[PDB]
Design a protein around this nucleic acid. Sequence first.
RNA 1: GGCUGAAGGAUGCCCAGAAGGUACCCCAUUGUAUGGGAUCUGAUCUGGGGCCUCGGUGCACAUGCACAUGUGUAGUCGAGGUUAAAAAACGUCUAGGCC
Lengths: 238, 383
Amino acid sequence: GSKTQDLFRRVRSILNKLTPQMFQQLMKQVTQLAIDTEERLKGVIDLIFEKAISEPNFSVAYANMCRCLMALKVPTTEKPTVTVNFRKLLLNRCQKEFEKDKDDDEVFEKKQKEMDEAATAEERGRLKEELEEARDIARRRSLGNIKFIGELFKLKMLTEAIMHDCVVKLLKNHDEESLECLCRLLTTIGKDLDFEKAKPRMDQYFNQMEKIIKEKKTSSRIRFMLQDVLDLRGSNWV
Amino acid sequence: ESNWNEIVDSFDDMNLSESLLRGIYAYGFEKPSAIQQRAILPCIKGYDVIAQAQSGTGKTATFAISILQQIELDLKATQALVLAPTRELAQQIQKVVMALGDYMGASCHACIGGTNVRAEVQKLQMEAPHIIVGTPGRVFDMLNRRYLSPKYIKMFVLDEADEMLSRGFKDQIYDIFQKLNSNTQVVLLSATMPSDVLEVTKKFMRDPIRILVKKEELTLEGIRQFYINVEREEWKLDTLCDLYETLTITQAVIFINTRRKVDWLTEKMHARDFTVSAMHGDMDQKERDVIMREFRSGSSRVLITTDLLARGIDVQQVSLVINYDLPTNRENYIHRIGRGGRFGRKGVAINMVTEEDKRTLRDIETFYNTSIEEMPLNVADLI
RNA sequence: GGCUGAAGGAUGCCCAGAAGGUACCCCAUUGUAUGGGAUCUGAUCUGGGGCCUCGGUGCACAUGCACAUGUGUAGUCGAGGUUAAAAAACGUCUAGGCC
Ligand SMILES: [Mg+2]
Ligand SMILES: [Mg+2]
Ligand SMILES: [Mg+2]
């Protein structure tokens, strides 16, 4: 029992120490971790994903760390004749995080009634602060998840199709949070996506948000980030 | 307070020009500070404003927005003067205006001393920047020889007048005002509200609008402070290792009072896979700036510092401060934490306190009137 | 009661099919939304895939005599064919096998 907890301690220490420059020296430590049980694998993937979506700046390193464990098979505890690759588990966490938006407003709605139930001014203000704080905690998560997925794409653990059906999904939901995520994703994947095999489809994406740029219906800051993304595209992604 | 009673939520309602908004958002501004909240609209409309707020915390940014909004883009001339207590802060304010005006197409300059006079003459002749920053003495020495245009200037600005009063250039600004026009907008800001600046108000600036920003440094309850009952000095490093093994550390600030321990712990940590940047008391100011910006960017995830150096410059984007050794200066504790700007919305403090310093913990807890909870074993969820 | 490991499963790769997506296009309502179609896909499931033929090298054997020829092939390098598909000899579990 203590082995799993010790493995979690060491994995979290490695994640905290992990930085882009010192990458290689820690990777041996990663390959020397005895991950041989579905519970240990799930916990390690939980730690990696939580760190990587809660702290986008270093996510690059974590992304590359995931590449070192792209092939780490483990036997499922339920049926010990089956195996789960690390990639299948890490991607499932990423996809599950990507589509929480369909339910996300719901939980806010489940708290929205409380806004009415906080009668006095002090209670009303405290409830409003908590719900906006929750909205911040979620928007910070979605952005981290998007950047992590985009970073996994550059390491080829994804393919162009998933990016092309993620960008379109973000864009179809014209709400602010989705457009912010779209800006972040394109900013981090433009160079590795702007190829001739995807030239037609891409040529619509930006054109679409150009209408957004011209509509000014959304908040200014959204337009401003979209202008930054379009200008970065105009300069060959550098 | 503010005799002007329009307190704004954000920049969106401030009716700024779109390009100026692009500059300010490319800089990074999201929510206004108090002087940004209030003291921006008065200077947009054209009123003459007296203000008092902390230096370097976006106080200059407010009049940067206002002035750049009032500047006419078409005319290539100097429409506003800015006068700073020194020359290097003038360079910083020029750079920060460029940060808010790179999309404008306008031009700003920093007329500073120790420079070739005819070089400045030619630079002004080729293109007159829309605004100019500088220091009253050399600014007058530069202007009096007709190297600029004291005609088109329609907003005169003083920043850190208390510092200019310390320089004793009251007559110098007297002549600078005497040179310029009559009905031009005037804004003066100061660090404090002394009697000399108040006398300057009634002499030059008509019908003052007063901005009184209250500087504060007490946000004790916002940030939590825990302590670890480690009693042996050799086990302090093991305690830090355990902390890194049981916490979700983004970046950390390591405070060490002395000098030898700084290099001792730096080498000990560098033996491990950590990436650190360390600052000493015998360092310069320039390489200190290099190290500070390096840690700010994120290429290093540990900043080892000494309290006075962190007082000289601070970054509040850090989610964990290890008070490795409690400071002999008890008051400096609040500086060591750095709670002066509500940095601890989610920020935590850790005191790795040796046994005999439990007494020290006691008098800081009592005198500062706080509550230092003990390090829970199951804090991984609480943070 | 402890050591070890079958291209027998699982995993990875390739192929087929299915759920799902599909900015652009077309068709319907017609409202720029939904549904259907066409490609393009397929973070996910269900199956299938461990072929031949020829050389080089190495090895072993058998002959003649250290050397040569013939034979079989080392998870061998290549060279071509064949099936829609010619794969990580696999950070895995077993059936066993041994003490
Ligand atoms: Mg379909
Ligand atoms: Mg299959
Ligand atoms: Mg099979």
